[PDB]
Amino acid sequence: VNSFSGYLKLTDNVYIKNADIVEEAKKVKPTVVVNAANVYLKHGGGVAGALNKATNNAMQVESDDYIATNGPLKVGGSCVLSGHNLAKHCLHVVGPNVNKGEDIQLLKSAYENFNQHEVLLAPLLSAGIFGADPIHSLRVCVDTVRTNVYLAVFDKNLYDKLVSSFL
Ligand SMILES: O[C@H]1CCCN(c2ncnc3[nH]ccc23)C1
């Protein structure tokens, strides 16, 4: 039993809710919140911009030190950093950004990072401003993640469409 509330159950391990991931994180304080990161951990817009703003830019400061030490992530890769005031940990995961021409096949590799954590709050990778089909992203999530994932879907029209079209 965990403290996630109001989610629709999609499968054995995947749950979905129309919710602002920032407001969700601030309520649940999950062990892991997933950020829709880029390889540079530049948290400028989309989910990443929102999560960083909620940390008063502490996420960005920590991220810049991470990059200065380690260099960029790989597309499809991840790193674990602090969750600041939102969660214990933030798993920064890089899905391919279609608006940069990156290979959508790397979306499965990106979701594989979730399997290293027993429970997560997460967005649909590569959705929104990353330019991928959110229905496809949800499918890859369901077919790749085996741990317990709670998906926060910001856009109401998409949440209802995601539910109504789910197979
Ligand atoms: O355009 C959308 C694409 C998918 C990721 N995304 C989000 N998902 C959940 N909660 C959120 N809060 C602020 C942004 C956001 C933005």
Look at the structure and name the CATH superfamily: Leucine Aminopeptidase, subunit E, domain 1
Strand order of the largest sheet: 1-2-7-6
- Structural class, from helix and strand content? alpha/beta
Give the total of domains: 1
Number of strands: 7
Helical content stands at: 25-40%
Biggest beta-sheet profile? 4 strands, mixed
CATH class: Alpha Beta
* Distinct helical segment count: 6
The ligands bound in this entry are: (3S)-1-(7H-pyrrolo[2,3-d]pyrimidin-4-yl)piperidin-3-ol
Approximately how much beta-strand content do the residues carry? 15-25%
- Cα gyration radius (Å): 14 Å
CATH fold-level topology:
Leucine Aminopeptidase, subunit E, domain 1
Element-by-element helix/strand order: EEHEHHEEHEHEH
Distance from N terminus to C terminus (CA atoms, Å) equals 26 Å
Structure description:
It is classed as viral protein, hydrolase. The entry lists the keywords Macrodomain, ADP-ribose, SARS-CoV-2, fragment-based drug discovery, viral protein, Hydrolase. With 167 residues, the protein is an alpha/beta fold. It is globular. It has helices spanning 21-28, 46-54, 58-70, 106-112, 134-144, 156-164; strands at residues 8-9, 14-18, 32-36, 78-82, 89-93, 119-122, 148-153. Strands 1-2-7-6 form a four-stranded mixed β-sheet, with helices on both faces. Strands 3-5-4 form a three-stranded mixed β-sheet, with helices on one face. The chain has one domain (8-163): Leucine Aminopeptidase, subunit E, domain 1, CATH 3.40.220. 34% of the residues lie in helices and 19% in strands. The two termini are 26 Å apart. The chain is built from six helices and seven strands. Strand 4 and strand 5 form a beta hairpin. The protein binds (3S)-1-(7H-pyrrolo[2,3-d]pyrimidin-4-yl)piperidin-3-ol.
